[PDB]
Design a protein that fits this description.
The structure is cut from a larger assembly and holds two copies of chain A. By secondary structure, chain A is an all-alpha fold. The first copy, chain A, contains 31 helices and two strands. Helix content of chain A is 63%, strand content 1%. The first copy, chain A, has a two-stranded antiparallel sheet with strand order 1-2. Chain A: Belongs to the ryanodine receptor (TC 1.A.3.1) family. RYR1 subfamily.
Chain lengths: 801, 48
């Protein structure tokens, strides 16, 4: 059924809608069995023939949809089929024949080789091969234990007249010779030249083993000649089939598409002929693609790399023509909307379903037995760069596909196996990555100049995707391969300009500050150079003034001093002094919005990133860690910064106009790890006691409220429901840090009961009693968490802990 | 991976269950069933 399906669907018949959703349903239901080398279940693993079938299906549907006129209904039904088919199709699959006949119910073209002129320099050994094949017929009989006899034998059940050629009448010798004549005359007819390789022209024991080794091109000729045989009998077979008017024979399908079990006769005939040629001295003469390019990963990526320049071609002059007169002229509207309606979801799902294979390395096999090649990795990196260049300073034009393109750019920001990109990789592609970083740095510099259009482009497209890139580099520790040489300088001016945005106090940068803080925290987590604390920055190898050349500093304008590069970023000691003063003063989020959304993310991502480069972790590998710790952050520094964070939250639980607690807790989640035990009684116990007292007082107010029930109780209910929303807000603002703290110090309390911990359990228990006794507290909890979507962060926090 | 504490759920009462351990080639383990509590480390950490 899949064979017939692959036959019909590439034509995109308007009646093939049901087969289209048939493929969709089949490949969402069954995808592990097709893709995973490990078997799905009792079913097992997919077949090579079926894998080739869906392969040819999906390339054929891709090109047929690329060339058919844009139909909204057909394309909309087709793209889930494409996504499901590609998801179930493994990327590393290599096809049976990369280059073959690829012909075109069925009308296989026959060969009029009787009319085709046949030289007589070869017909002598064609006749000898005809006699040899009838002798091999007798040999097959003697294998079948019905050794060939001259007269009719009833028990023989086989050929009753086959005789040695002397007594064998030539009237039947002609009618068994003529099919062999047509066979090899067709073989010389399909632009193949045969001749005696060496000098030369009823039971042959030596056979012709069709399974011996042979050259690729000549074996492809053998496959093409078996297809020729299939066409030869297929024309008369369809002549009889069209008389019937219904159904089809299992062998009445294209020879390449059909299964291996049925092509046995044609394959054995053609290959036995070819081995007969090779063994008996007949030379016949009529691509070389490596396995990496033979993979569908490389094949699809080749189509994709082709798509980027095509897309940019029409969209560039499309925005030009709509900026000049708004003329509806398009080069190929069908292809334009084919991309805009099909390819964006396709890459969206493919780079999420097969992201693990792309990220998987032959050295470090992240995937379950499947890894891409280094070649594939650098040109998916160039694929990402090309897609970025398609929409560089251009996402304002795209409105209908804007969420799609930005999302796909996040996905290509992920799954970037770039360890093997500067290594064994093309420096043109590395220069594409450098151009990405330099263009981003130039555009963000323009952004900070306007911030004191391309600015909205920075708002929607560049900032989140670049944050995703910094996240990816930090997570997969790709700093040594992604950011290096001029990329380091471009990131240097980027971080300087972003901290200048932190300096600036206008309303637009204030609104944009959350995304800037996310980007800078991810940057610091992916940053291999101690930009902060530049006192011992020369010890850090990754700095330009340690590895990069003095000559390149001279030609790039580097002042040979990181402080002279970016004097905007001050010393961590002064950040300590400032945050300590704010904590002691009880200063407000309104007073320090820049710190919260710029420098706190950087700090809380800097201490854990540089916890091994600082005195917090002396190098356990003494010979490897020869240089002294270049960074100055210690466990004492981490404890003290946690104290500052606890101090600012305890400063402004009272205010209600602060919804940045969610991002603050998310950023501070790693920085609450490795906290000293006295931090409990210093800050955790006072804070939990504060909200214990607040919960008791507010529930007492709700007690005097629930004493009554009327409209006045309703307006008081509004007041205490706002109070409850603040209660839930700060409970699940400070609890995620607390769970990691108590996870760290639970072993000590369990080994020795610590009265601070027991009092902390008493406090949280009293809040638990209040939560159980207060009904409106629970429903405000539900309302706040689900409507504001804290529940996802709650699940993530509970999963990591 | 899903964030569930229990590894296995919905276990029928069956005939019962027994402590079992499988060792690969050249592996050394200490199957402390819990005869002596002082020898039983981390029980107070998780189980007491």
């Amino acid at each position: 059924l899949l064979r017939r399906l692959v036959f019909d669907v590439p034509i995109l018949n308007e009646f093939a809608k049901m087969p289209l959703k048939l493929l969709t349903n089949h490949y969402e239901r069954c995808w592990k069995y097709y893709c995973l080398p490990t078997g799905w279940a009792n079913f097992g693993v997919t077949s090579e023939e079926e894998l080739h079938l869906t392969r040819k299906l999906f390339w054929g549907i891709f090109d047929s949809l690329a060339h058919k006129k844009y139909d909204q209904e057909l394309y909309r039904m087709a793209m889930p089929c494409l996504c499901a088919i590609a998801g179930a199709l493994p990327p590393d699959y290599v096809d049976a024949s990369y280059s073959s006949k690829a012909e075109k119910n069925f009308d296989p073209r026959p060969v009029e080789t009787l009319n085709v002129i046949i030289p007589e320099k070869l017909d002598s050994f064609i006749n000898k091969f005809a006699e040899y094949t009838h002798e091999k017929w007798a040999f097959d009989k003697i294998q079948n234990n019905w050794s060939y006899g001259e007269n009719v034998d009833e028990e023989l059940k086989t050929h009753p007249m086959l005789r040695p050629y002397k007594t064998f009448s030539e009237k039947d010798k002609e009618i068994y010779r003529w099919p062999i004549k047509e066979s090899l005359k067709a073989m010389i007819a399909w632009e193949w030249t045969i001749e005696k390789a060496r000098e030369g022209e009823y039971n042959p024991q030596p056979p012709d083993l069709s399974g011996v080794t042979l050259s690729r091109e000549l074996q492809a000729m053998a496959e093409q000649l078996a297809e020729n045989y299939h066409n030869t009998w297929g024309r008369k077979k369809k002549q009889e089939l069209e008389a019937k008017g219904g159904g089809t024979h299992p062998l009445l399908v294209p020879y390449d598409t059909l299964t291996a079990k049925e092509k046995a006769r044609d394959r054995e005939k053609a290959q036995e002929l070819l081995k007969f040629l090779q063994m008996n001295g007949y030379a016949v003469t009529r691509l070389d693609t490596s396995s990496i390019e033979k993979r569908f990963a490389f094949g699809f990526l080749q189509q994709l790399l082709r798509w980027m320049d095509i897309s940019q071609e029409f969209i560039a002059h499309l925005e030009a023509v709509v900026s000049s007169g708004r003329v509806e002229k398009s080069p190929h509207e069908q292809e334009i909307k084919f991309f805009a309606k099909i390819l964006l979801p396709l890459i969206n799902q493919y780079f999420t379903n097969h992201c693990l294979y792309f990220l998987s390395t032959p050295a470090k096999v992240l995937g379950s037995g499947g890894h891409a090649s280094n070649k594939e990795k650098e040109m998916i990196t160039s694929l990402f760069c090309k897609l970025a260049a398609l929409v560089r300073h251009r996402v304002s034009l795209f409105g209908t596909d804007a969420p799609a393109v930005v999302n796909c750019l996040h996905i290509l920001a992920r799954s970037l196996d770039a360890r093997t990109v500067m290594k064994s990789g093309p420096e043109i592609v590395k220069a594409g990555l450098r151009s990405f970083f330099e263009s981003a740095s130039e555009d963000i510099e323009k952004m900070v100049e306007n911030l004191r259009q391309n600015l909205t482009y920075t708002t929607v497209a560049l900032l989140p995707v670049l944050t995703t890139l910094f996240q990816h580099i930090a997570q997969h520790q790709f700093g040594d391969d992604v950011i290096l040489d001029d990329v380091q300088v471009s990131c240097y001016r980027t971080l300087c300009s972003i901290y200048s945005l932190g300096t600036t106090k206008n309303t637009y940068v204030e609104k944009l500050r959350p995304a800037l803080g996310e980007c800078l925290a991810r940057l610091a987590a992916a940053m291999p150079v101690a930009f902060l604390e530049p006192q011992l920055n020369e010890y850090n190898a990754c700095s330009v003034y340690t590895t990069k050349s003095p000559r390149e500093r001279a030609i790039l304008g580097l002042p040979n001093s990181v402080e002279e590069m970016c004097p905007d970023i001050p010393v961590l000691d002064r950040l300590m002094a400032d945050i300590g003063g704010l904590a002691e003063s009880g200063a407000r989020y309104t007073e320090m919005p820049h710190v919260i959304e710029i420098t706190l993310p950087m700090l809380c991502s800097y201490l854990p990133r540089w916890w091994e480069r600082g005195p917090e972790a002396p190098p356990p590998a003494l010979p490897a860690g020869a240089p002294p710790p270049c960074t100055a952050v210690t466990s004492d520094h981490l404890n003290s910064l946690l104290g500052n964070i606890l101090r600012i939250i305890v400063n402004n639980l009272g205010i209600d106009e602060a919804t940045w607690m969610k991002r603050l807790a998310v950023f501070a989640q790693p920085i609450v790890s490795r906290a000293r035990p006295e931090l409990l009684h210093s800050h955790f116990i006072p804070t939990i006691g504060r909200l214990r007292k607040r919960a008791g007082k507010v529930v007492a107010e709700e007690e005097q409220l629930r004493l009554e029930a009327k409209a006045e109780a309703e307006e008081g209910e509004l007041l205490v429901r706002d109070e409850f929303s603040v209660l839930c807000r700060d409970l699940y603002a400070l609890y995620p840090l607390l769970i990691r703290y108590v996870d760290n110090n639970r072993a000590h309390w369990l080994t020795e009961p610590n009265a601070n911990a027991e009092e902390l359990f008493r406090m949280v228990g009293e809040i638990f009693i209040y939560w159980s006794k207060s009904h409106n507290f629970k429903r405000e909890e539900q309302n706040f968490v689900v409507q504001n979507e804290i529940n996802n962060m709650s699940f993530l926090t509970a999963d990591s802990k | 991976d899903s964030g569930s504490e229990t590894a296995f759920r919905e276990i029928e009462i069956g005939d019962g269950f027994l402590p079992v351990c499988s060792l690969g080639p050249g592996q050394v383990g200490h199957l402390n069933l819990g005869q002596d509590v002082s020898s039983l480390r981390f029980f107070a950490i998780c189980g007491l």
